[PDB]
Symmetry: D2
Subunit: 56 residues, 4 copies
């Protein structure tokens, strides 16, 4: 019975670290979306101006 408790304390500890890892993942995927959005604006800005210089 005392071993079941110790085994539970380890699983719970592993569950805590799992969420800590996923919180790290979630923030990384968030940073990626910020990049994707930046790259969208950059591509739009350069293409718009490239066409202007090319077609005048």
């Amino acid at each position: 019975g005392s071993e079941f408790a110790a085994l539970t304390k380890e699983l719970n500890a592993c569950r805590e670290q799992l969420l800590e890892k996923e919180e790290e993942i979630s923030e990384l995927k968030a940073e990626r979306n910020n990049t994707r959005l930046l790259l969208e604006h950059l591509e739009a800005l350069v293409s718009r101006h490239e066409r202007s210089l090319r077609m005048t």
Copy 2:
């Protein structure tokens, strides 16, 4: 068989733990590739802006 069921869940949780830290590793590596691009983009833009900034002073 609660002990057995607990050990299996504990095992599966540790598998997902390695699984999640590998994704962190891949995202961090992917993040570094982004930084290298941004470094390069800032370089090309600043270098060209520099050429324009000097041309106005030179051609004057």
Copy 3:
């Protein structure tokens, strides 16, 4: 008749000279608008690059 020919070419030379000055003015205007974009591109890129630094 030679004077008349010389004056016409002189007038035409000034007419084309005005066109070039107008072209230069447009080119320098377009150039300045280009620098504005570049400064904006550098600003956006440098900012997001600062967000993606390690610790």
Copy 4:
């Protein structure tokens, strides 16, 4: 007559010299303009290629 024609010729010649000078500055501006366009071509290619890569990993 000969003095008048010569002086008018000098004026036309002066206009011609300034015309080619203006054309030289134009050709330089247009060259710089081509440099910028090429940069934007590489920038566009880079950001789009990287955008497509982030939409997979």
